[PDB]
């Protein structure tokens, strides 16, 4: 359908990220994000959001990376679906740690530790 393109854009972005190309990957995940939103598929929207977050951290843009990892939390709350939540919490904490806000990073780590045994 175009769901086809969504799958492709996610896989392609994941590939560019694995090959030291976060900028190219950012472009792919960005399209996938638009596709998933236009297709109203929250599950894939969270995956697209994470890809953007990862691409941005890789580039050192931690503040912008937080904005996209936070979407995973936001989408999850709007949908009552908690996949990616644990990873999102941890990634955000990683970002704040890279930003020097160890206080806020600790708070997010704490939330993430509390989920480490649940599934």
């Amino acid at each position: 359908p175009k769901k086809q393109e969504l799958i492709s854009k996610l896989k392609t972005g994941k590939t560019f990220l694995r090959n030291q190309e976060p900028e190219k990957a950012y472009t792919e995940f960005k399209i996938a994000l638009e596709l998933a939103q236009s297709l109203k598929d929250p599950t894939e929207e969270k995956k697209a959001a994470r890809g953007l977050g990862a691409s941005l951290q890789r580039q050192g843009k931690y503040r912008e990376a937080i904005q996209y990892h936070s979407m995973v939390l936001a989408i999850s709350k709007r949908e009552s679906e908690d996949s990616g939540i644990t990873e999102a919490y941890g990634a955000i904490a990683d970002c704040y740690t890279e930003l020097g806000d160890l206080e806020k990073a600790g708070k997010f780590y704490d939330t993430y530790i509390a989920r480490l045994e649940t599934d």
């Binding site: 644990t86 740690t97 160890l102 530790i113 480490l116 599934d119």
Partner: protein, 84 residues
């Protein structure tokens, strides 16, 4: 306390390097047997094992005398070579 926060980050990344490396080898060895539910299952397995392993240490890196927390940090640093 704030001093153990970077160790948590570093330990996460150490764990993830291993998880990804092994997950990739696993997928390559499955050929055409990879479908959505199967792929998702193996992914959940990889992070299920890692997370349950990381829980103890990382819970013990926060909030108990501060002195033991620092020793937990030091031991992790030695055992996993976190501070190259």
């Amino acid at each position: 306390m704030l001093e153990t926060v970077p160790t948590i980050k570093k330990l996460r990344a150490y764990a993830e390097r291993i998880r990804v490396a092994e997950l990739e080898k696993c997928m390559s060895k499955m050929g055409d047997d990879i479908n959505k539910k199967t792929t998702r299952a193996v992914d959940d397995l990889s992070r299920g094992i890692v997370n349950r392993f990381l829980h103890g240490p990382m819970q013990h890196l926060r909030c108990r005398t501060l002195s033991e927390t620092l020793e937990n940090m030091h031991a992790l640093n030695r055992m996993y070579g976190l501070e190259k």
